[PDB]
Enzyme design. Structure first.
Site, PDB file in Angstrom:
ATOM      1  N   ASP A   1      23.720 -28.882   4.077  1.00 28.04           N
ATOM      2  CA  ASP A   1      23.751 -27.768   3.131  1.00 28.04           C
ATOM      3  C   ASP A   1      25.178 -27.474   2.687  1.00 28.04           C
ATOM      4  OD1 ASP A   1      21.005 -27.520   3.420  1.00 28.04           O
ATOM      5  OD2 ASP A   1      21.049 -25.579   4.433  1.00 28.04           O
TER       6      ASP A   1
ATOM      7  N   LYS B   1      16.861 -27.010  -3.628  1.00 27.34           N
ATOM      8  CA  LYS B   1      15.630 -26.342  -3.242  1.00 27.34           C
ATOM      9  C   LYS B   1      14.971 -25.614  -4.420  1.00 27.34           C
ATOM     10  CE  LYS B   1      17.527 -25.509   1.449  1.00 27.34           C
ATOM     11  NZ  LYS B   1      16.618 -26.311   2.327  1.00 27.34           N
TER      12      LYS B   1
ATOM     13  N   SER C   1      24.465 -24.485   6.909  1.00 27.09           N
ATOM     14  CA  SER C   1      25.826 -24.038   6.587  1.00 27.09           C
ATOM     15  C   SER C   1      26.704 -23.715   7.802  1.00 27.09           C
ATOM     16  CB  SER C   1      25.769 -22.816   5.667  1.00 27.09           C
ATOM     17  OG  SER C   1      25.177 -23.145   4.413  1.00 27.09           O
TER      18      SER C   1
ATOM     19  N   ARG D   1       7.380 -32.815  18.085  1.00 27.53           N
ATOM     20  CA  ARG D   1       6.474 -33.239  19.157  1.00 27.53           C
ATOM     21  C   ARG D   1       5.011 -33.227  18.722  1.00 27.53           C
ATOM     22  NH1 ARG D   1       9.400 -34.124  24.642  1.00 27.53           N
ATOM     23  NH2 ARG D   1       7.936 -35.819  24.206  1.00 27.53           N
TER      24      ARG D   1
ATOM     25  N   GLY E   1      17.371 -20.733  10.486  1.00 23.04           N
ATOM     26  CA  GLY E   1      18.461 -19.783  10.712  1.00 23.04           C
ATOM     27  C   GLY E   1      18.631 -19.214  12.113  1.00 23.04           C
TER      28      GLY E   1
END
Ligand SMILES: O=C[C@H](O)[C@H](O)[C@H](O)COP(=O)(O)O
Ligand SMILES: O=C[C@H](O)[C@H](O)[C@H](O)COP(=O)(O)O
Ligand SMILES: O=C[C@H](O)[C@H](O)[C@H](O)COP(=O)(O)O
Ligand SMILES: C[As](C)(=O)[O-]
Ligand SMILES: C[As](C)(=O)[O-]
Lengths: 248, 257, 260, 248, 245
Positions: free
Chosen positions: C19, C69, C224, C153, C141
């Site tokens: 990002d 995005k 970020s 998984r 985040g």
């Protein structure tokens, strides 16, 4: 080892036992017929003396002494059987303590693995008995084998959690993954009635089939037993199976 | 290879393992008689900076443990590569995997894992754990966490040890344990690995209590180094843990704190 | 045609996508060895497609592929990015969804899409809508890798099951998963997903990145956080090397020393 | 009727002129965005005198007299609006009794059809207001249009039951089936913020869009309003829309 | 073959009557209900020139292979027989002979098609003589098809998820404007008016059971059903045909 591809037949006397042997059964299961218990030893001896193939009998679940009795009689296999009236609702027989091998029932891989950890030498994958309805056998053979395929291909580090979720001993799952299958023979049982039924169970990955007393209530038991035996052995020969289905 | 890893853990009996954040604290712990130290950095809690772990490793001659998040295979491999003596797959760090713990059988270095009951203990052992830490909630200073679980685990062990052999498969199902581990427990009369208490062990009396309840040793946290005299405090814990039935000594050791 | 979009998507295995909010960050990402960059604009409020100006700034700053995005279901935001010459569109759950029920019909586009998924059912539905690449991801985040791990998984366990399962059981499996059976049939045929599948969600340390590769990811997305470190280029670099050399634990150990 | 158009919220003559200059097909006069009522007539007259395009104004749901007041003021459209504080929770205005046309809100086809039966001349498909989040508009435009497509193509003899299930008047459904669409214009509203948003609503089958005061909080309102207008008109011109998005 | 009637028969005599009445095919039939004795099926196969169907229990792969080997023209994986597998139907793609399968809604229909079904039978409960079973499901299936045919292309994946259908089958349905296989009605089709109703509701044909041969004049009754199904909008004819039975 118990001959894979084989059919095991329920018999109540010497006459039926001989017919089963003549039809090509790999073994017979001696039976007597409220509370259902181990059969009278006399009946079992009658069957043992009547044939050269292995004789089985099965006992009530958890009935350690019934099993010891059959062991002393010289039976070839003991079937710790859910169709008899359970003697213990919580604990199965510790089959590791015996000389004679046991066959046990299972409905899923968790049960199968628990039976193996108790010392089972052979499995019978089976639902409800006496219905003539193959759905019982099919449901559970599909379940057990689907669960095996999952275990065989799953990431090694996920097996402990899989064991917890199934209620299985992890070392049995590890063994299954290692072999690519169950470490014991697994026969189908429950409503196997027609030659097509028997072949279907083989198609679904059974190692063999158990069949009940229905055979001897037919008009021609030896022909019927024979048809099941041939269908089970030649389970992909659909022309043969079609031909074998005509009589019945 | 399991036997060597377990043997290494075994030699720690009666000992105290101490959390340290730097070389200074590590030396104090070693001087006080700790059998090992647990190197720490201190939101998401992860494996500590390798620099901090190396600082601790260079500062002492006793074994150094560090840590990893539960399920974090690579953090563990990193610590293995650093030459750490034990890896602690730790529930106080932020779990990396909610469902699957590390397959510790694939490692050279031995692991310590947490447990709250015998089912957990047995599952950790089946995954390859070489040592156990029986522990409830961390950071409370409250011993009840450690006590609850050491009582549970040991009560469940005593039950297994004395129970009818033919009932173990069902017991295993009920506990969520691998039956072969239960069978091993029944054979040995105890867990096949060392089992230390942890969780709120604060006073010398606390440490001796855990030994009274059947612990093989204790973990103690950074609280030691927030006291006025860390070396004396660490020392008192060490002596209480070793001489856990010497109540006159423990009474004397409790005066300072 | 899907075949060509997929061939383009292939050119990302073992890679790290980063990002970036500007040209400076984009150059650092390229210099650190990122396979592509994800151009972003930036509390509580509506999160939309970024200002085209910001995206163009990033496109002009680097030679590696640039992604951007759009909101889920926002057909026109996607067309806009397509018109801008973006290399990949990310129909992204971290932006504020524009459509709660229907994702973009990505088959109608020239540019390839990456889509998120949490399980094989979602993955297969995204593929049937025309996704050329997948991002297996939980919550964003957090800095917590459990999100990525849980879902990688799950997805890979479900794939292994499908690959080995009896052919005649797939239709029922599809029903149970909410998946298109033809995608499951393709998966069984290939032994894996027919598109690339990257991990995303809390990938913070080099060990995290290598873990995701250990768990069967084809690569990783990183956010970020890299550019909030004291030495972004070193940090980005460490993630790139750890992702590429995901079984070199001595190297990963060494690479972990620096970071703050 | 005014398809492809943009209707803009304005609080004064200055804003109204900007909206007209940008190419708005109409303006919606407001006082502001406690209890929210019909705007002071003075403010509405200020806006009416400032432009030549149609002027709309809001009344509370069910407030028959507020509506009659706006009718007497010479307003071009009345918006019976859910963003004002409802005056009647159960009954909307009987709009058939008015000279001036009404626009009403709707979230699904049932609501749309009921508003039409009350005499609505235009619809606004809208969810929650003031969020800047287009999902509100999208959810409901998708729902309304999906329900319309179903009605248009469904078997004629199933409409009465469909009407019951939707809570719709069957004669409105019959009219919809006949026309292949709603018998009135249906604009999108709710969080339309960017040029891409506006074009999206047209892609989803809206006849136009409403936009709020957000336009006049930007650095360059006339450019922003303009971009929305052009994006709504040229809703498949993605190069243009891309270019229009650069500024703000 | 569209507009047709398929009739249940238990022997050669009934089969010949069905053929003579204008049936497009016959369904050979003989607690647990299984595949019929091959002898009975062969008897029916030898008795007529029109296609013969028989079926098997749901999931019974080997019963199906047996019928295939006997030279049957169609296999009916049938819910009126006792299911052999509660979870998995036969993988019909692996067979030479075509299958007919039952369905109650579009999700089921699409799943049966994905398994390789070559024909569908839209049917509720059997043996009731009550047409509501057939009607409910033919209305459902066809209403769902009309919705799919006219719906926005980008909504199909979500529609498929909601129905439990394979999206590629929905895409095919949208493309053709109908199911890619023939869909006959079955369940309680008793009178000529019933048969014509099913056609009015969009069926491609009808199945009828053994009730025909319990009437006083089977050949006349079978005949009336056949003509009503073919001429399903000829209400004067249907009225006339209804007088006898
Ligand atoms: O101390 C136990 C930790 O909370 C673990 O995260 C978990 O509860 C144990 O996992 P399991 O019992 O499933 O092996
Ligand atoms: O990553 C999952 C997204 O948030 C989707 O919007 C949704 O939660 C699941 O996708 P589907 O629409 O296929 O159920
Ligand atoms: O009575 C027959 C039923 O319709 C089937 O058993 C049923 O359709 C199960 O299959 P599925 O789960 O694909 O609908
Ligand atoms: C389900 As059990 C207690 O018979 O293993
Ligand atoms: C639910 As209504 C009062 O908008 O018809």
């Amino acid at each position: 080892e118990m001959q894979k591809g084989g059919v095991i037949m329920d018999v109540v006397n010497a006459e039926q036992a001989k017919i089963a042997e003549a039809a090509g059964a790999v073994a017979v299961m001696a039976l007597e017929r409220g509370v259902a218990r181990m059969a009278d030893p006399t009946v079992i001896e009658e069957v043992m003396n009547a044939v050269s193939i292995p004789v089985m009998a099965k006992v009530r679940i958890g009935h350690y002494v019934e099993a010891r009795v059959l062991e002393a009689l010289g039976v070839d296999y003991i079937d710790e059987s859910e169709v008899l009236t359970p003697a213990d609702e919580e604990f199965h027989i510790d089959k590791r303590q015996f000389t004679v091998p046991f066959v046990c029932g299972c409905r899923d891989l968790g049960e199968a693995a628990r039976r193996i950890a108790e010392g089972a030498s052979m499995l019978r994958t089976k639902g409800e008995p006496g219905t003539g309805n193959i759905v019982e056998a099919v449901r559970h053979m599909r379940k057990v084998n689907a669960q095996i395929r999952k275990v065989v291909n799953m990431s090694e580090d996920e097996l402990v959690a899989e064991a917890k979720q199934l209620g299985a001993p992890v070392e049995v799952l590890r063994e299954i993954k290692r072999l690519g299958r169950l470490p014991v023979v697994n026969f189908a049982a429950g409503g196997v009635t027609t030659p097509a039924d028997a072949a279907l169970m083989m198609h679904l990955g059974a190692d063999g089939v158990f069949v009940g007393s229905g055979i001897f209530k037919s008009e021609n038991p030896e022909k019927y037993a024979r048809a099941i035996v041939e269908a089970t052995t030649h389970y992909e020969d659909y022309e043969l199976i079609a031909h074998l289905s005509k009589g019945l």
